[PDB]
Structure formats: structure tokens, C-alpha cells
Symmetry: D4
Subunit: 181 residues, 8 copies
Amino acid sequence: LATCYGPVSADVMAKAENIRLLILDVDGVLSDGLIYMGNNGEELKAFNVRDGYGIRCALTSDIEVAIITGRKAKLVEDRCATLGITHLYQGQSNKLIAFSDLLEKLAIAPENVAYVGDDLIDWPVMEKVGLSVAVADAHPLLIPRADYVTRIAGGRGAVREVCDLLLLAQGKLDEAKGQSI
Amino acid sequence: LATCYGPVSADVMAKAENIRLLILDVDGVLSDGLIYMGNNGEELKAFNVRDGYGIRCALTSDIEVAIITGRKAKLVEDRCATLGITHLYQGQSNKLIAFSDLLEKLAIAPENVAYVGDDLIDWPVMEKVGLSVAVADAHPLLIPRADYVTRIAGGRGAVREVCDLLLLAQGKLDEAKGQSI
Amino acid sequence: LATCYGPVSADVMAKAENIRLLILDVDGVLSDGLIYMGNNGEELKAFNVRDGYGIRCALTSDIEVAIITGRKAKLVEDRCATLGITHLYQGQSNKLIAFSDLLEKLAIAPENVAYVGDDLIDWPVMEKVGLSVAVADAHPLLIPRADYVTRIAGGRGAVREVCDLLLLAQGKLDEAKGQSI
Amino acid sequence: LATCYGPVSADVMAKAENIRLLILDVDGVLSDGLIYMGNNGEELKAFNVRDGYGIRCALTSDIEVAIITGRKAKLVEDRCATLGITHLYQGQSNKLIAFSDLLEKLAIAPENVAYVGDDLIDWPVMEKVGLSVAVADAHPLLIPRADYVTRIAGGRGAVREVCDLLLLAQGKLDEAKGQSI
Amino acid sequence: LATCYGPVSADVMAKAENIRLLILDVDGVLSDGLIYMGNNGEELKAFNVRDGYGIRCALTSDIEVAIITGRKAKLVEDRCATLGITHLYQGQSNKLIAFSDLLEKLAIAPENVAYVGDDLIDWPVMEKVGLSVAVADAHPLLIPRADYVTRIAGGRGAVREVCDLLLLAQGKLDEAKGQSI
Amino acid sequence: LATCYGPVSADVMAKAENIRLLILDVDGVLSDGLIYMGNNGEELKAFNVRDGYGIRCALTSDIEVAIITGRKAKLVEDRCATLGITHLYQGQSNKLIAFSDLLEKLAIAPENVAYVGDDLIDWPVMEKVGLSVAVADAHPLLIPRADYVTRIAGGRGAVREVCDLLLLAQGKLDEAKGQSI
Amino acid sequence: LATCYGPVSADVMAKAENIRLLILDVDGVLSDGLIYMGNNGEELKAFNVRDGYGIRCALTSDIEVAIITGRKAKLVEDRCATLGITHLYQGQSNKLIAFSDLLEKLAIAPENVAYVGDDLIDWPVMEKVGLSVAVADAHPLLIPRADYVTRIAGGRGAVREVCDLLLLAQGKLDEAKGQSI
Amino acid sequence: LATCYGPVSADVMAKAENIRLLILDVDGVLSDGLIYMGNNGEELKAFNVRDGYGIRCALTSDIEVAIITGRKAKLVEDRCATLGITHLYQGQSNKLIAFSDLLEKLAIAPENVAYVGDDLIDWPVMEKVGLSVAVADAHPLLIPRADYVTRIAGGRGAVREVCDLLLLAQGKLDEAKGQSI
């Protein structure tokens, strides 16, 4: 029940034991929600190396990592490459289209999927997964709907927390090896 | 009287019920008030996807959104274009001019207007609107003057908070549809 | 979904709608867990008027308030008499005997019962009730087990928080009349 | 506008200028809302010396102090005698009667009166007074209704804060004299 | 390594593994350091129920509890009797004599003893014991000397945390039974 | 320049060097400002043991401890007797008479005197003494006037902090001895 | 004595009354101390619009603004030109040289100058000016040396706070106008 | 025993006294763990001037500074050039290889080495050094393993804190010189 972020329920741990796919949102989850825009059309976004370390640990521990986001940017493709993420969907408002696509591509059951969100747009997908997750500073209306609420804020180590939770539940946390990138 | 951010007065809710136009300042409201500057003259500014979802909800729920700011940047024009904001005024030191222009263009009364500010130069317009809003971390002197002080700080989701307030007051929050962009 | 303490899940509200009996612990729930002891043999315990107002509200709005505690003190009886709590259990280490006694004396189903606890000794009862409640500053291992976690600490208005929640779910908050005692 | 606890609005300062009578609730205002009960019938309530200083200042700066509380206790009469409070009403569920009694006894208009409450039961009186005040930790549903919300919690200096505001607004803060008792 | 109060080092767990005797100070550890005094000579002190729960768990799980304190009060004997603590040393300025006697009476080595302190007077004993513990709000000069620093402050559940640590280290946590008294 | 409570100025350290007398207020300084009153006439006040330890270290290091308070209570006389304090001035609204009485009976210079206050009744004395100290939670208008401001609040170890400052400045901190009473 | 950031002493207000020149460090004062660096040699620094408004108020209200920094960047020249600052000294590791040059060029006494620093490299200049200022999050060793310590952190509104303090002291605060740039 | 960040153990101070080489991780230690990425393949990272100052102090006080990181970026090389760091290892999966290379290059024993890490990838090296340090916001599992945990978070001044600690232990802090760069 107890973790390094605090105690979690026996139900949350049992759901986490069956997770084979980890779907993430970008803005608000892998970042604090900020979009950096410039005068010459530059777009910047901050990622956390702690979350990078976690994604590497999960991908090398038989847990697939996928991303479905509403925005479309070349930088997100570059971040997926650096971490080895091959399943990526950008410009997706109705995220169930991309969700149905992953279940058909990876032949995976919805109960074996985990989703980490931060806004109300994430819920239609969170409602169908085995382990719905909302970040600490997710929109107040999403927090009570998720199976688990992270202690660490979005883009501060929230994805890492979930990665550590999935690894601990499946008995891989200590054995896990990753790159803090 | 109850919201997802905390209790509000009936006065504030009744004010928000009549709002047809939401005017926003940029620096300190849509951002955390930070101006990122570069050696080759590059300028950057950070926006929140949470605010964007709120603005996207507002514009689809028959509430116009406008922006008045003292500075001028192409990046602001891009952010407005991303969100579908068609009413934008930049390089404005007297904001009452643009305020009167919006009243004439929309055939609207000052009471149907809400204004979110963060500094003393916002007050001349806030004094005249139906709902004056100061952000959590606004200038200490502006805070006591506004009808509503937000819980969330500028650039962290304060606009979304205001958007959610206007939608709840008009019974639109439940079926509100936007994009986290 | 919206309350004055923060947003709650639909499942917590649905559970609260069918609550006809509320059971409360004393130490750490009605008080802050402190036991004032004296040289001549005095004993003191602090209660909250805010909790008193809520307890009065529930009892006048068709919700029975009962108390099960592990310590025995005359002061508890006086507080029960002031608020109108006619069902009291003191000096009870095994709380399962007192719980099954309340169900038989009032002909009530376990799903129509809500319990507010603060320690591991409270869990046996909390497992079988319809709405299990843990206070904000409850024991770390008890927090994730409960259906709902209060925002307000024990002896600071946590009982009031539950009372307000039950009244809001049953649509009795606007008509609720109590005394600040 | 600026005070030593933080800035106040020009409207609140204007409301505090007319005040001749200051009515104070006990539980949650002069105390932190705690009721200390014993096994022989002992009842204790914590008062703040800092609040006592401000009360002695108001009574010497041509401002009358009154107390209306829903509970009856001898300790309250003892505190009133220590601070020189002549007007006292206890065991009052319908506080409008004690409020109407003060208006006729002192030949004072409702706009010249100020109340400091903490719970919903205080509101019917707070509606009719010239300056309605709620403490920093007053019930969530009362806070947005008051004209002024104090920075200091109940029984921590919240009365003193109100007292300091009335003295400053009437230009008597510097020449104010009181005893820290 | 991970507990419900947060992670601890492998060395702390191994030091807590051997503990057969837990010694606690009264003021600042079992209380928040406050001494309530009266005009007629009444002396009062606050104790925490969850501390009592942990002590009840400790005594039942083959771990002796002793108390050495500098003050003398009848209420301390009353508290020790309620929880079943037989070893009590009141009016002890020099806390070395009581420590030397407890080693002789219980026939125990210094590495199987754990002391929880809060001030500089507690150090001479803590220097010799196998597990020296300082409470969260101990004197700033004692904190960096102890083997483990609690997260919970004295009189708020600090003793419980220590008890829960020893029980988990000895593997008795799941089957530990106590009373919230 | 550096203490265990944080860095202090050289001027404050030099002022604390010549200190031979330490005058303390009772309410807001030795206590947190709370006065407990019963229906029978019982009065209670809390004192911190760590605060007592510092006072004991001061008296046994050629630093006299005096007490001037606006309130009059029997319990304070008992507290002075326990801590070995011989100087007491209770029921003093005009503290300039009591301060003049200390410079005459101990034959001491104002610059060798340190005062620890909490309210505006303490400044008339503090203005003339060598080291004027305000507690962390002193009245907002007193804080800026003092030479030094404590990190710890009144009744939680504020006096101890002042005592530690005086002893280290006089180089007696390492050799100091007291009891946690 | 009263400001919108909290109470200040009569001595600090007297110092701020005579200020004609405000000297500011860049990193840690006008920014939060961060230096953004890129692979192609890009360099960014963040500034606050609230600080901008304050500087614009000072310059138009007969208070010259100067900058002395140990680093050198083109972006700083661009920021000064936007704010209308004509006195800029970059790459100065001995800030005494640029200090004496300002006193000669503007014909001004040291007591009529204010300095806002964040690290120990700022002290040699701060030691000689009429009003030395350390920011809220300045280096712990610098803080207790300054005449005034700001409530706001560097690059968050600390400069605005000082600007407001000088304007309030000189009776220019109300009449002063600026731009949120 | 006392620093400007708070008290430390004599053991930590003794370990810090021996240090001749300081090895730092970049991400989460010199920065706050954020990787800024753009659509044109730009990469930005934030460094603290306060850390830069302390690094300049270390290198001019006979304490070498080295950097080992799992990522590889040109900006880091530029940052090292600004601060005079000559020992830099990038793209380092196995940090023990770089650790072995450093000790063989500089003829230095592990006991004379300090390492400041933030994640589990740093522990293998930290296990061998004389002073292992974890930043205030390091991964929860790393914190209790280190000899010293900093008060300041990564990229906010945690590296400066370590530099200050080494200099104080070696009696160099008072006369150490650096540049805010």
C-alpha cells in the first residue's frame, strides 16, 4: 500500500498491476501547462528529465507508452524520439478516435490501459481505462473522477510518479534501469 | 453560490450571469507577467492551455472574448489566432478607447462586460464594467477594488477560472465544449 | 459535484443521498485528538460549534447522528445532550458490536449508513458502511481506504463538512436550520 | 486604503467611518470556536488579549461594544466585566430581537452598526448592519457575503483587526489607548 | 525503505529492527510543550490519542515503553496508567541515572533502546542509544544529531510515527492491535 | 553572524552582548495570547517548557529575568516560583513606572536591558532599552520598530530563541545549563 | 508607516524620502536569477511587467533608475531602451567603479541613492547608500545587512515594491502614472 | 555546527572539510530539471547565477568542480566555459566510468570527493564519495540515502548551498570570492 510518495489504496495497486499501456497527455501532464510563443513563430515547451527517466523505465519493463494530445508541434515528435516513444497522436480533440486506434494496433484490452490527464478533455478516455490518473494541479472538476490523484504537479515529476507506481505494483521498481534524459 | 474554485457571492454570480463580453489583459493575466528577451531581439511569452480551453468554451457558448494590452507582439496575434479571438488591441496606454470601441461594435452595455486585470492601469476600465476581476497575485492595491478576486494566479489558470464562473452563472458549464490548446 | 469545500465525485454524492444514519468518532473527528488531563484528576476535551451547528442541521432534516468511541467520559454525554444525540457508545474497543446494535435498534441497512473515522480502529466499521469518511489529518494508512477525504481537519469543522455534504446531496441545505452551539 | 493587515477598499473604509456600535459574536470570533468541556460541568473558552486591547480602545474612542451569542455561559459575563462591556445578550437563537433592542436602546441607525460573525446564523443580522464582517476562517458560505473579511483567524486577533480598522477610519488609531488584557 | 510517513534509509530500518525498548520524554514529545496552569494551582497537559494507540500497539508487540521527564505532576501518572506504562521517572533533571537503571532492570543492551527527545537535555541519553529520534519541531541544534527526524510534530502524533516505524521494521505492523485512548 | 535560527545582523549581536537584564511580557510572548475562563472563575494560561529552559540558562549565566504584565493573575506567580524568577510587576497598564522601578532596584543602564513584547503597550519601554525584540506573531505595527524579530511565535519557543541569542553573543551558549520545565 | 505590502518603520520611510537614484542589479532582482542558454548560443532572460510599471513611475516622477550587473548581454540593452533607462553598466565585477561614476555624472550624494541587491557582490555598494535593499529571496547572509527587506521575490515584483516605497515616501504614489511594459 | 541555511551535524561538516573535488549533475541539480524544446530543434536550459557565484568561489579556493550528465548539449559546454569548469562528461549512461576517469586523472581519493545528485542514476557514484548530497527536491527514494540534503531546490541555489558548506568547513567562506554569472 505504501509508496515513496505516500500510501495508495489496494484497489489502485491492483489496477496498476495489470497495466500494459500508458497513455499520456502532453500539456499539463508532461509540462506545467505553459506554451512559449515568439515573434518569429517559435514554439517552446519544457519537459522534465525525471519524467523522462520514468518513461524509459516503463518502456524497458514491457509497458508501452503512448501520447494523445490536442496541440500539434514538431517538438513533441523530437521528445518522443529522445525517449523512444513510437505511438504518437497530435491535433486530436476527440481523443477516442486515437484511443480506438491503439487498441486495434496493439491488440490491448481497455482495462489493461492507464491514462494520465489534467483537463476535462481527457475524461472521455479516462472513463474507459483500467487506471485513470489525474495530476495534482489538474482542473478541479477532473480530480474527483480519476482512480488516482498524483502528489506531484504536472511537468514536475507527475509522470514519473505514475511510472514508479506501475513498476512497484508489478514488482519492477528496484530492478528498473533508465536514463535521466 | 458554490463553484469548483470556492464559494462566491450572489452579487458576483448575478453579475456573471449578464456577461456577454470578457475582456482580458495579457501580462499578469494570461501570463505570469514575465517577458522573456533574447540577444538577437527575440521575444517570448508563456500562455496556459487551461486558459485556452476556457476561451474556446466561451466563444462557443455565445460569450465574446477581447484582449487589450499596453505592449505589442506578433506572438499575441498568433495566440489569438490559435484560440479564434477576433477582437484584439495592442499598444494601448488608454484602454478606455478600445473599451468604448467594443461597446459600439457589439451593440453592448458596460454591465454585460467582465474585465480581468492585474495592475493599476487596468482600473479605469474595471470601474465601469459589470464584473471587475483581479487575479490572485495582482498588485496589492488593485485587489480590494475588484468585484471578484480569483483563487488561481495570473498565467496559471486565472482566465479559465473566470470563464468557468461565467459559464456556471449562465448554466452552460456542464455542456461546455472547448479544446486544451 | 460542486460543494463549498471543493468538488466531489458523483459516486460520493450518490452514496450521501441515501444516508439516513451518520456515525461519528470523538477523538480526532469531533476533537483534534487531544486529551487534557489534570493533577486532581480533571479531564477536558474541545468540541467545535461549527460541528454543533451541522449536527443540529442533520437531526432536524431527517438524518440520525450517532456516536461510537473508545474512551469513556461524562463530558461526552453533556455534549450529546446539548446537540440532541440520543445514541451514544463509550468505552468500546470492538466497534463491530456497537455497529450491529445500531442497525437492529433502528432497522436500517448498512448502505444507508455513513461513518467518519480517523484511525485504523475505525476501519472495520468503515468497510461495511455505504459512505466511509476519513478526516484530513487522519492516520496516513486510513486516508486512501475511505470513499471520501475531508478538507478540514478533525475538531476544526470536519463533521460540519460531512453534515453539509449529506444535506446538499439530499437537497436540504437551503432549508437547513441549526444553532451555533 | 492601506492598513497594517493589508489594503482595504474605499467602500469598506467609508462604511467603517460611520460606525458607532460594534456587535461581536463569541464562538468563532472572540474564540476559535472550541468548547472545552469537563466531567463535573466545567466549561472553558479561550479569549485573546490582543482582542481585549482593541475593545478597550473602541470603548474609549466613542465606539460601543455589544455581544450576541447563541450560547449562555457565566465566563462571557466575566470577560465583559474585564473589558467594560455593558450590552450583552446570551442564549439567542433569533438574534434579530437582540439586534433590534440595541437600535432602540442607543438611538442608533442600522448603517452606524458593525457586526463580526463566523457562521450562517450570524447572517440575518449581518445583512442589516452598515459594516458586515466575517473572520478569516468563517464558514465558507458566509465569507463572500460579508463586506470585509479579516486576515486573522477567529480568537487569534480577528476582533483586534476589526477594532484597528474602525480606529484608523475614524482618525483615532494614533491617539488610541487601551489595555492588553 | 518506504513507509506511510515517507521514505527512510536502510540503516534507520535496521536500527529500528533491533529496538526492544522505547523511551519517550513528556513535554515537547507526548505534548506540544505546553504547561497549562491555574490560579488555584490546577495543572493541565494535553496528550494525543494516536500516540496512545501506537504505545498500546508497542506494549502488546513485545516492546517496552519507558518515560523519563524533568517535571513532576500527578496527571503524568494518570496518563501512564491509562496506557499501561509501568516505567516512569518524574522530576529527573539528570536523565542518565534513569537510563542506567532501566538497562539493569530490563537486562538490555544500549543498541536495543530508542529515545525520542525534543531539547538539548535529551541528548546525553540519545548519544548512547541504538536509535536516537528527534521530533519534527525539536530544538534546531538537536535535529541534525538524531538518527531519525519525525515528520509529525510533538503532541500531534510523533510518538505514533516512531511506534509505526519500529513495528514495520520488526514486521509486526499488519498484526498490531491497539486502542485509540 | 550565524545562529541555529538563521542569520542575524552584527548590530543585533553587539546589542545582545551588553545585555544584563531580560524583561518579558506574559501574554503573547510567554503564551500565545489565549486566556481560558470558566463559569466558576477559573483562569488558565499556557507556558512552553523550552521557553523555561532558556530562562533557566539565562539566570545561571549572570542575566536577570524580569516580568511586567498588564494582566493580574495568581498562576503567573506560581510560574515565576518554578523558574526561579524573583521580579514581577502584574496589573500594570503603564509600564514606564515598572521599568523605572527595575533600573532603581538593580542599578542598571537602559542599554544593558532587553525587552520582548507583542503589542503596542510594550513600545514605550522598548524605545529606551538596548535590545528591543518583537515576537514572530507580534502586532503588525510593533514589528518594524524592534531591533530584532524572532523566528518562533509567542508561546512556542520565542523566549528560548531570545535567550539563545543573548548567550551566544556573550559566548555562554555552549556552557549553558537549564531544565525543560 | 503603513504600506500596501505591510508595515515599515519610520526610519526606512525617512531614508526613502530622500532617494533620487535607484540602482538595480539584474540577475536575482529584476529576474528570478535564471539564465537561459541554447545550443546555437542563444541567451534569454525574464523580466516582470509589474517591475516595468514601477520603473516607469519612478523615471517620470523625478527618480533616475540605474543598473549595475556582473554579466553582459544585448538583451539587457534592449530591456533598458524599452523602459527608457539611460544608465546601464554591464560586466562590472567591481560595482564600486560604476557607483562613483553615477555620483559624479548626476551630481548626487550617497544618502540620496537606493540599491536593491540579491548576493554578496552587491554589499560594497549597499553599505554606502542611503537605502540598502535586499530582496525576499536574496542570499541568507545579505538579508540581515539591509535597511529594508522586500516581501516580494526577485523578478516577481520586488523592484515594483521598492519603486512604490519611494513614491509613497515622497508623496508621489497617487499622482504617478506608468505603463505595464 | 551552524550555517546560514540551518544547522548541520559535526559529521557532515567534518566530511565537507576533506573535500577537494565537487561533482555535479546538471538536470535537477544545476537546473530545475526542465528541458526546453522547440520546433526548429532549439534546446534551452536554465542555470542559476547564485550557483555560478559559488562555483567560482570553489575553483578559486582549491576545490575542483566537475560535471557528469546523461544528456549531451552544446549549451552545457558553453555554461562550463563561463564558469571555468574543465572536467565535463556528457552522454554518460554509466557514471561510474566517468567517476573512475576523474579519480585517475586528478590523483584524488573517493573520501575527498563530494557528489550532488537528484535521481537514482546518481546513487552508484554517491555511494563511494566522502560527502553524498541530495537536492531538496531530489527523487523521494534518493533523499534518505544521502549524507546531506540541501534546503534549496535544484537550480534555485542548491549547488551554491553545497559550495557554501564546503567553504565554511574549510574556513574559507569569509574570504571567498566569486562572480554572479
